[PDB]
Amino acid sequence: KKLYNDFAWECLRRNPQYISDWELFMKNTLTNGGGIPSELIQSELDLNAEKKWGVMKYIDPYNSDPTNVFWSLKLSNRSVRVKLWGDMSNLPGVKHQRLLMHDNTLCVKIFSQNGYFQLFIXXXXXXXXXXXXXXXXXXXXXXXXXXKEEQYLGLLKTIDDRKQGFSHRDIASEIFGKELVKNEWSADSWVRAKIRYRIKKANALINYGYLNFL
Amino acid sequence: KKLYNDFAWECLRRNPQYISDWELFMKNTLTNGGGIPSELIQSELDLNAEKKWGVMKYIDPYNSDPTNVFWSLKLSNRSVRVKLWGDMSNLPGVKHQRLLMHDNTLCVKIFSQNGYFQLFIXXXXXXXXXXXXXXXXXXXXXXXXXXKEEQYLGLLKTIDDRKQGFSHRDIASEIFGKELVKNEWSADSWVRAKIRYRIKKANALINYGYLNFL
Amino acid sequence: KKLYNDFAWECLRRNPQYISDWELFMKNTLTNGGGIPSELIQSELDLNAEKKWGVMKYIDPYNSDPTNVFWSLKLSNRSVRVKLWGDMSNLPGVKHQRLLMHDNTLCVKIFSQNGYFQLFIXXXXXXXXXXXXXXXXXXXXXXXXXXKEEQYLGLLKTIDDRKQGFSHRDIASEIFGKELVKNEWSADSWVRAKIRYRIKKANALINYGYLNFL
Amino acid sequence: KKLYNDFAWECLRRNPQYISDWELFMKNTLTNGGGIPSELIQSELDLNAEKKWGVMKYIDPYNSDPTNVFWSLKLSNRSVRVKLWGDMSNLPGVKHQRLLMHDNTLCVKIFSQNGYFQLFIXXXXXXXXXXXXXXXXXXXXXXXXXXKEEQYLGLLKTIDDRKQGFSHRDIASEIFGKELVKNEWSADSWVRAKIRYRIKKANALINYGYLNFL
Amino acid sequence: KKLYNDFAWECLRRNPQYISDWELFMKNTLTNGGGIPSELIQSELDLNAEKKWGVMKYIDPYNSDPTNVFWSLKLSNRSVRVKLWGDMSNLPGVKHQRLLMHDNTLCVKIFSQNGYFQLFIXXXXXXXXXXXXXXXXXXXXXXXXXXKEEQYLGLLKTIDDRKQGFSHRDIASEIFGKELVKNEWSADSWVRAKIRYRIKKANALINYGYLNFL
Amino acid sequence: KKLYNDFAWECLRRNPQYISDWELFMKNTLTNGGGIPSELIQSELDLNAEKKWGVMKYIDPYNSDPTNVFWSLKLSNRSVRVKLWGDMSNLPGVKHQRLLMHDNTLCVKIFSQNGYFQLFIXXXXXXXXXXXXXXXXXXXXXXXXXXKEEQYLGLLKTIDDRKQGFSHRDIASEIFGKELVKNEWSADSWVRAKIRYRIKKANALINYGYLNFL
């Protein structure tokens, strides 16, 4: 089952350029390569996506489950470097997924219903010694996992409506009602401007604005 | 003096389309209209900018002081409707600016060194009665004014470097050093990918991503 | 069943002048008026009681259940003005009662086991904008309802003992014991002074002192 | 100078029966007794006032300074029994006053700008051992002294206006304005009912309602 | 069953001099006295142990249950003087034990799974009146009972290993492993110094260092 | 000036065996070695003291200033391993001292008026990743330094009195008074037992009991 929701992945998988990239990645691996890309191994093609989109591995954009969605250490604010486990990784209600990277570094994601956290490899982590710093909030976030976004997802729903063929007025009627739209829709109307603002907000998130959520 | 910094305004005033819009707005008002646009009155041309960019009045993009930068009620999460003052508006260290809107509604912004807050017109405000809701956080934000963003501004600094003519490698040397760049710059290098990610992050903020900060 | 206890009503319904007023109100409505006064409608006679005693409707003083006991907006510190619900009014454990006032204003009381709260008419309330004010405590009190007084009720129990015909010494024996009273009762004895202080405390509450508890 | 304000004393000294009692107490001590009643010693006449009014010593009702106003142990919720000091009693900003009682018990009041506290006689106090009890709040109140009431005093101001000869309408004009009163004053008017409610509230406090504030 | 663990008793009952004292106390009472020492009565011989070891009664050092282990008022930081109960002493999960002392003072210990507390004789206790003092922490500790030490007990386990005949190297192998000890054991080795430090730490606790834990 | 007080050092420097060890260490270095032991370098003789007493360097027991008193990593609960500073080490009111160890590891002590903290070598520290662990309290203790013990020092004062030649009765008179001692001193007296308990408590601290305070 889908444990958690990755909002940045919901933005990225709706990017038309990423969808085109993934379909190209599938075609050259199914008809020009070794075949189908559980045992996650980052290839060279996947590292191109990490340097371009942020995900360490090309993930099917049709699937909302972010189990195999790993975010680059160069971008993630929910990752730590760990040196050398069974206690943290086997709580009834906490799952984990592993990924072997191109530089032979092992990334393990710890996730539950409250989010995810990535560990790049007892368990010891080198925390930067900065007095009165919010760098310790990473440990608090990991504890919350082992223990506006509803409006943001509604913006992505509007993008799904557009790509289905619905017009701005169609989406306006869906949100405000047929009677309100017939009475107020105009050239410089505020109902039209609100729907346009929904598109602009979501487009900015989809066109790499999701990077600011990592 | 510049009391506070409006991060959304720092994004918007760097938008090339908004800069072009403002220069067009100045030309048709200086050579085709009544002349120069302290006594802020929202005209019809200003309301077009409110429905397009979010600011209730065209503001010179060259000035960082957000004194006369007013944000639309349709977008602002720092605004309330107030019905009918001298105590709140005259604290030593708290300033205020007024704007008369096209619909004859008066908007008064209360700001200090900790941010701004807009009041749309004793003083009584109709707060929505929702049990266990964060709608009361608006009153807490107003109290904080009457009593990552350093990284976000650094992203906009990179946009200023680009518009000046500096290349991606030039900006990479500015941040990481000439020696590191000469050794590591390549086609699919991570230093080049980091600089590209800076541009993408800032571009998303500039291209209406600032709306998610209102 | 009796959900909560209104201490101010316990004081008022023990007032001999109010009891006489209610019996007069019943006689002129049962033998001179339309008959018996679930569908609470404030008449002109009830508004006389609101301007005299504080309750918006004459309530039988023999009943301790304060379901239909409504307190005047001119006196209540547990009331708000609300403009235009099913979520707040239908929690398993929270009841409500309505009253239509003489000025056609609808008062709805929301009560549970932790107290009551009155709303005078989504749901929006005009809260006075006063910085660093305890006016927001009304919302906290309403949240506590939707989520010394044992000594004060003992004082009213002493009034019930007096109206039954028990003397001050009888009540002293009831509280301190027959042996203590026989040994210590005197003209200027402290046991007699304590019982007198009980009466004075309760009489002050009954003779409009309950108004300070609204 | 007057350090603090005793609200219960402000109620009691406005009681006409207490004022008559004090004037009788002065006459029988100035023309029938030893003369004038700094060295506070509770006599037999003072103990009659303690059993009747609550103050351990007859105090001039014309003086608002509650320095020599001591409240009976039988009524005070701000008193403790102490067994056997210079550290607590000599803080720059904390004063103290002593009273020798008729039963040879010494009462010492510790007061500052935040209130008063009475000690009835190192310093050790026998606190009742009750689990999860608010009896320890007496120590917190004493710490606050060594470290609605503005509306209540306004009610007593209305009593001062009445005893000066001002009518209910005069006081209504003082609070609401001459124009409002001339327009709204009537037989069953709400402006008249509000002023009547002020009197009733204050009268209840004055007629032994202050006992509930000790 | 054993409700709680008294760490000071775990130190004292491992003291060789106390074990010798108890065996002498048993011999002179079983072959020279009245016989066997539920009804705890402190004799003169027991008071010698109170002035020497701290326990008000000689307790068999072989038993870890500290039910009858009472600590002297001259040493205990978990004791109060109480003057004159059924509510506190009969919570489902809270037990109590009584001891009659040589000076006819009754000591009652209240204990549960969270520790013990001793009362030396309603229930009233004379608390010292000291402003901003931690003397009130005794009431908080008693409330916690009515509602490093795992490392310290491991130090006493090392003493048990020594008295059984195990050498320092034997205990080193028990803690660090046979392979580590064979490789690192030397004259001035750190593994030998760590085991020596364990002994010194525990010996200090056993040789009256437990007094600092009362 | 002496910034802070090291209680464990106050115990250790009063140890007669350590004082003898230090005098032997001085004699073999002043008449058999290189001479006098600001530039702290741990020699082989100093490491013998680290494995025996805990201090990384022999310190003159006559000096109470614990500036050059360093505690072994094998014993200190106020030390961390740090990998590679000017911000933390140069606060107006925070000093630091360095020591080069026999294994070429550099130990730097950061201390102020609130205590000391040792760092064994930006600045990064490998913190053990244990969920719901008190290992993070080391960072809180370091923050407190960069931002019963009065009774324990009184116990060491009693040891100073003994080594000066004062008897147990002399110390009893010093604490309780000449009159109390002359009246109560006996064979099995409690005043004599209290003084004996002071000695036993302090002796346990001095004879390696200080290790439990590191």
Residue numbers in the entry:
A (entry chain A), B (entry chain A), C (entry chain A), D (entry chain A), E (entry chain A), F (entry chain A): 3 to 39, 42 to 88, 100 to 136, 145 to 170, 181 to 247
Task: Copy text verbatim from the article accompanying this structure deposition.
The type VI secretion system (T6SS) is a complex, versatile multiprotein nanomachine, which is dedicated to the delivery of toxic effectors into prokaryotic and eukaryotic cells. RovC is a transcriptional regulator that strongly induces expression of the T6SS4 at moderate temperatures in stationary growth phase. It folds into a novel hexameric structure with surface-exposed DNA-binding sites, which directly interact with an extended sequence in the T6SS4 promoter region. Expression of the rovC gene is tightly regulated by the global nutrient-responsive regulator CsrA, and induction of its synthesis is essential for the transcriptional activation of the secretion system genes, independently of RovM.
To gain a better insight into the structure and function of this novel DNA-binding protein, we determined its crystal structure to 2.3 Å resolution. RovC consists of two distinct domains. The C-terminal domain (181–247, pink) is formed by five α-helices which fold into a helix-turn-helix motif, as predicted. The N-terminal domain comprises amino acids 1–136 (orange) and a central region (gray). Amino acids 1–136 fold into four α-helices and a mixed β-sheet with four β-strands. While a secondary structure can be assigned to the central region (gray) that forms an elongated stretch of amino acids, an unambiguous assignment of individual amino acids to this elongated stretch (gray) was not possible due to ill-defined electron density and flexible/unstructured loops which connect it to the rest of the protein. The asymmetric unit of crystallized RovC contains one molecule. However, extending the crystal lattice by generating the crystallographic symmetry-related RovC molecules reveals a hexameric ring-shaped structure composed of three RovC dimers (interface between monomers: interface I) in which the interface between the dimers (interface II) is formed solely by the N-terminal domain. One extended basic patch (formed by a RovC dimer) was identified on the outer surface of the ring mainly formed by residues 225–240 present on the helix-turn-helix motif which is likely to be involved in the interaction with the negatively charged DNA backbone. DNA binding assays further revealed that the R225E and R202E substitution completely abolished the DNA-binding activity of RovC, while the DNA-binding activity of the inducing K175E mutant remained unaffected.
